[PDB]
Amino acid sequence: TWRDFGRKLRLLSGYLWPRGSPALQLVVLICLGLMGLERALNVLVPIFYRNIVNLLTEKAPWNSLAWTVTSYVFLKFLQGGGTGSTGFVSNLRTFLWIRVQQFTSRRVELLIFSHLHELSLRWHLGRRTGEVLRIADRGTSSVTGLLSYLVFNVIPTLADIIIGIIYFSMFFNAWFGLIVFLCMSLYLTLTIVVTEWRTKFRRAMNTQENATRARAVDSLLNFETVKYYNAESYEVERYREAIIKYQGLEWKSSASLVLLNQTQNLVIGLGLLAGSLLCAYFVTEQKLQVGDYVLFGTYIIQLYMPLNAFGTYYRMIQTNFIDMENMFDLLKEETEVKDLPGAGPLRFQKGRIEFENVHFSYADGRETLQDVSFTVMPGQTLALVGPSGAGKSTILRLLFRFYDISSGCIRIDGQDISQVTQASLRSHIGVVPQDTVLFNDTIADNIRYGRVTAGNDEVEAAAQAAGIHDAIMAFPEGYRTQVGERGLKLSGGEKQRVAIARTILKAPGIILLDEATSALDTSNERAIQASLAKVCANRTTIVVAHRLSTVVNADQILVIKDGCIVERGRHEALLSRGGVYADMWQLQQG
Amino acid sequence: TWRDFGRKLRLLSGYLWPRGSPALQLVVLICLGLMGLERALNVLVPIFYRNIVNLLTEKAPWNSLAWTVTSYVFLKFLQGGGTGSTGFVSNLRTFLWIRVQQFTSRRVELLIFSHLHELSLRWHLGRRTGEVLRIADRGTSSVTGLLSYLVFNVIPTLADIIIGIIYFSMFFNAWFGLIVFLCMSLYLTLTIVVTEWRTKFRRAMNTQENATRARAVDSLLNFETVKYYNAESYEVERYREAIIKYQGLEWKSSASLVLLNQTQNLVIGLGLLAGSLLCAYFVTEQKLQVGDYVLFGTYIIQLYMPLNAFGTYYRMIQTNFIDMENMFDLLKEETEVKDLPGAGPLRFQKGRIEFENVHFSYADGRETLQDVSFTVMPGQTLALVGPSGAGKSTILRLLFRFYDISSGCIRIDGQDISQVTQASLRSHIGVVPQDTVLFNDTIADNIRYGRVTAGNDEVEAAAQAAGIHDAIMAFPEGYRTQVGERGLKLSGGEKQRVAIARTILKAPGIILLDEATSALDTSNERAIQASLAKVCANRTTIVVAHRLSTVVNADQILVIKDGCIVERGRHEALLSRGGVYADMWQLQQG
Ligand SMILES: CCCCCCCCCCCCCCCCCC(=O)O[C@@H](COC(=O)CCCCCCCCCCCCCCC)COP(=O)(O)OCCN
Ligand SMILES: CCCCCCCCCCCCCCCCCC(=O)O[C@@H](COC(=O)CCCCCCCCCCCCCCC)COP(=O)(O)OCCN
Ligand SMILES: [Mg+2]
Ligand SMILES: [Mg+2]
Numbered sequence A, B: 001t002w003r004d005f006g007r008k009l010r011l012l013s014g015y016l017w018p019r020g021s022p023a024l025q026l027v028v029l030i031c032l033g034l035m036g037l038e039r040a041l042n043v044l045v046p047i048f049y050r051n052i053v054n055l056l057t058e059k060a061p062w063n064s065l066a067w068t069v070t071s072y073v074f075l076k077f078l079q080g081g082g083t084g085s086t087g088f089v090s091n092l093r094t095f096l097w098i099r100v101q102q103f104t105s106r107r108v109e110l111l112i113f114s115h116l117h118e119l120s121l122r123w124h125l126g127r128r129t130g131e132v133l134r135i136a137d138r139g140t141s142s143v144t145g146l147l148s149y150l151v152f153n154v155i156p157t158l159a160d161i162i163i164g165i166i167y168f169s170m171f172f173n174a175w176f177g178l179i180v181f182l183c184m185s186l187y188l189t190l191t192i193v194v195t196e197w198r199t200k201f202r203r204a205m206n207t208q209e210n211a212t213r214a215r216a217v218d219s220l221l222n223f224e225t226v227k228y229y230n231a232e233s234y235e236v237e238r239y240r241e242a243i244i245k246y247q248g249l250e251w252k253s254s255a256s257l258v259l260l261n262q263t264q265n266l267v268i269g270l271g272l273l274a275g276s277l278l279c280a281y282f283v284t285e286q287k288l289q290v291g292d293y294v295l296f297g298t299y300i301i302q303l304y305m306p307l308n309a310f311g312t313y314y315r316m317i318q319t320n321f322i323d324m325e326n327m328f329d330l331l332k333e334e335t336e337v338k339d340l341p342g343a344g345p346l347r348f349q350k351g352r353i354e355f356e357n358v359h360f361s362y363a364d365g366r367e368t369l370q371d372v373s374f375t376v377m378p379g380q381t382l383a384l385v386g387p388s389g390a391g392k393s394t395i396l397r398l399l400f401r402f403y404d405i406s407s408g409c410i411r412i413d414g415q416d417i418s419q420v421t422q423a424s425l426r427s428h429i430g431v432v433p434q435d436t437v438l439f440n441d442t443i444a445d446n447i448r449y450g451r452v453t454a455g456n457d458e459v460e461a462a463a464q465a466a467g468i469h470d471a472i473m474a475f476p477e478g479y480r481t482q483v484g485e486r487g488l489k490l491s492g493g494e495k496q497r498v499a500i501a502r503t504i505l506k507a508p509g510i511i512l513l514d515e516a517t518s519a520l521d522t523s524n525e526r527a528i529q530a531s532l533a534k535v536c537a538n539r540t541t542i543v544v545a546h547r548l549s550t551v552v553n554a555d556q557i558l559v560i561k562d563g564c565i566v567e568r569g570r571h572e573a574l575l576s577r578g579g580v581y582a583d584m585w586q587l588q589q590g
Helices: A004-013 A024-041 A045-058 A062-078 A098-112 A129-146 A155-166 A176-210 A234-253 A256-284 A292-298 A301-312 A314-330 A392-399 A422-428 A443-448 A456-462 A494-506 A525-533 A571-576 A580-589 B004-012 B024-041 B045-058 B062-069 B075-079 B129-142 B155-166 B176-210 B234-240 B256-284 B290-295 B301-312 B314-330 B392-400 B443-450 B456-463 B494-506 B522-535 B580-589
Strands: A353-360 A369-372 A381-385 A407-412 A429-432 A510-513 A540-544 A556-560 A565-569 B353-356 B358-360 B369-372 B381-385 B409-412 B429-432 B510-513 B541-544 B556-560 B565-569
Touching: A004 A314, A024 A098, A024 A155, A045 A062, A045 A292, A045 B256, A045 B290, A062 B256, A098 A129, A098 B234, A129 A314, A129 B129, A155 A176, A155 A301, A176 A234, A176 A256, A234 A256, A256 A292, A256 A301, A256 A314, A256 B045, A256 B062, A256 B075, A292 A301, A292 B045, A301 A314, A353 A392, A369 A392, A392 A540, A422 A429, A429 A494, A443 A456, A443 A494, A456 A494, A556 A580, A565 A571, A565 A580, A571 A580, A580 B522, B004 B314, B024 B075, B024 B155, B045 B062, B045 B075, B045 B290, B129 B314, B155 B176, B155 B301, B176 B256, B256 B290, B256 B301, B256 B314, B301 B314, B358 B392, B369 B392, B392 B429, B392 B541, B429 B494, B443 B456, B443 B494, B456 B494, B556 B580, B565 B580
Parallel strands: A381 A540, A381 A556, A429 A510, A510 A540, B381 B541, B381 B556, B429 B510, B510 B541
Antiparallel strands: A353 A369, A353 A407, A556 A565, B353 B409, B358 B369, B556 B565
């Protein structure tokens, strides 16, 4: 509708006045003043011109005429090029604003890069990288740009037309003071009537646009596959057939503009005809002197120039508006798993975890995990075994509180999860992820990410827990070797080794291992678990392992089939029962 | 230096003539013409003004005066504001160019999205996503936004000054002429001197800029890690401390400009003073007439204003230059592993492979692979076993020819691979990668990527071989579900099952498996390898497996220690030897 526009402009205005620093809160006044003086000069230059022509007509000494001429030339210097150009009053402000603009830009940026890191997991696993980056880079340049064309080229221009009608009405004749008024009115009423009839087009451009780029920016973030299967053509072609349909529409909306920018010309044109013709009539009938026909020949032009100038800008102002809209959209989304106000930090003494009839659904259609309850005594290791797709990892994801349960209760150390602050909750737990990703930085700094204070001593010693010390030293330059983006450059298993080294360095109260021996050879896992046995002496540990050679000494064993527990107990007590665990053990060992 | 500018401009100008379609090769002439007419009207308006002032001075009938004024209110309509704005002999050109700025904004896009996909691996595993995207999205607007300010606002302006000096010399006094000439000369000699002094600054801005964004577009790609280990603040801060340095070094290059834009004002100023004083003097000494003063008071103002306007654009015309420079660099590089001239398709008959004393290195510091040779008969399944980091995957990488060798020879089916075209070579081999990635699309289209002409019936039949048909149908919406981005949405092992189904659908001449049973439970591996034994009836296979339970029936077994072959033979022939393979097998079996 035509009201939302208003709401939007209001918001953009809020970012002008700096809020916090007094000094700056002054520059924003002086600047305004210079704006004031220039408006006056605009109505004092034309007048002086009349004088230097009047005197010349009647004749006078070379002396008197001289001083007068100098005056005119001076004032032109202080205001050259009308509104929207250079000069000496104007450009003296563009040198006292550079500072304020750098206080608004920063603030906006460090706000669209904080929110993106507070949103929840569900949203993140569905975004389209391409877009979430385009929006965040062009966005911070929209707000600054517009706030500088709506306070320095629009509002000023408008004020001038008015000052004009006051004059040309109480200092010249009168009728002339009407010809100007009507012109403007029509100019406006021919803009609105047209701007609307165009919006039917601009709207159906943005949508197609954001979908004529996606596919592509997703065939460059997955290079390997587009090579193995030797495509590399199927792709280039598909693009061509999308850069065509988009173009077919922009023509429509890049021609409407030429129409709007031509109809306006006429309205202006007619105005000049009326005025010029009438003025001459009067001077013939001895009512206004010739001199005067010069004033109404300079003031006018210098008052209609601005309108026409905006003609070469309409194109951009549109684009900038669109981008602002998008950014603001994002800053209105809401986090899903929030925190309860008035919450206290967790009290950690032993580390006991208990589940109480938890039911969970992903897409509200089926229950992936349902009716699970277990208890772990402090200082004990629990293991989970089952077929693929049974829901093993969902329990670990839910313990860390990345999602919210629907029913039941989860309690640790006698305290429920839902009322303690997450920030204090996550400081007691460290987990090795299923897949390893490393920053595009050096291996030493990748290892140090567990805690940003330790010196090379601990990094070095902790490097011995995973058995990577004897391997890194053989590398050229030792621990300052590069890793590459996402860690693809390094190798296949030492990514897992450095991940487990990070976790060991962190040394949390409770340790959880999703997969640890996925990529290691059969002669390296043993040593790793032997080293880990000395570290897990007094810490609760949950381990998941498809291979059953690791949980033979597990303190407790659980079997998950389709999210419902099927049996439990130790190793030998499960073997004697002759159940599914015994069947799988026999199948694996013989 | 000051000559590179030359080569640069030459290129940006090699794009203003559609090279192909004829029709278009015409619009580019009529456009040029309209330019001509306008550059004339500019000297036929000031003149008419004088006439309507002379007549008024001496008196005349309302009739005659009337038919004169009309003229000076028509020519104004056609000319418009000036040399950089709207009108009616200008707009009519910006409506016949839209169709030529869309044949130069395509050709230059489907050329920076092709080259990025023919570069080789080394480069790719070392880029910085953040940047490569940017360079390729802002880049296609520079070369289409400068060609429009170097053939419609510069060259035109220059022509006008000259026409002015010709006149004002052979039609008016001829002494004034000198004034104009000198003024312009000085204007230029100041621009050149100042521009260079400034360059020292602009150069040291770009560099810091591209590095104040890296550690920021790389903490939004690897989201998980920035949560597990908490953080989420350590980051926001680092950003702030880098948005400060950049700023401090721009208030330098955003103030130099204000200086350059004030000096120029003075030079222009002086010119007007000289002229006016002189002209007035002559009119006193009876040489010119009042009428004449009016001409030298309108022509000048409309011959200097066009220049000042450029004062408010300098900012952008810099940024655009910088971006063009970068794009060119990318389009100026070179592929690493090219193809020998000529050459022909590979003559495949059976499927034999041979290695002949291959020595190769990665970074010229260490020898990753050295002294490797083997051979496979047409129909078996060689296997490789060894410790981690021994170089198992490098052999597979070197077969596909992603990198290149230093010595030795590689022969397939009797033909060396170094001369045969890679396009024909890579149509006979299909490999499941070590890490599985999926397109952000539906599962059916993702699994159809093996061959684009496949049908639903054969896709459904082939999905049964991997054992996933009985699993997908239980999902809601069946085969039209989403997999998210990169495939993190699906599961932990179903990605691997989908990848192996893709490979089976492709059905190449030679099959290679890096790791297939990494994420599968022990109850599903058997059925899978039994199913895979049926399709390898007449296809050579190479299999890598850390677990030795799937290699017991291998036709040939190799042991790779540190890239040097230690022993070879079958399974029982190696068990009796009592070597390292026997030790590993015992240790695994317990
Ligand atoms: C905070 C105080 C502000 C005081 C002044 C406010 C009013 C300023 C004058 C506005 C006159 C034009 C109003 C009608 C157009 C409004 C929309 C617009 O300007 O840009 C739109 C996009 O339109 C364009 O593509 C062209 C953009 C420029 C059009 C207006 C040009 C400037 C104003 C011209 C008249 C004012 C006098 C001359 C200014 C030289 C943005 O999207 P939208 O509002 O159309 O979307 C929702 C409604 N459909
Ligand atoms: C193909 C035929 C072209 C004919 C005309 C060619 C010459 C046109 C007039 C050029 C006059 C200015 C020459 C000196 C500046 C050249 C550089 C430039 O314009 O922009 C530079 C960046 O400078 C700026 O930031 C300001 C950009 C605008 C400066 C020139 C403004 C337009 C020309 C002004 C004089 C012409 C008459 C008035 C123009 C309306 C781009 O980088 P760089 O060349 O400095 O880097 C290597 C050399 N250091
Ligand atoms: Mg999992
Ligand atoms: Mg490997």
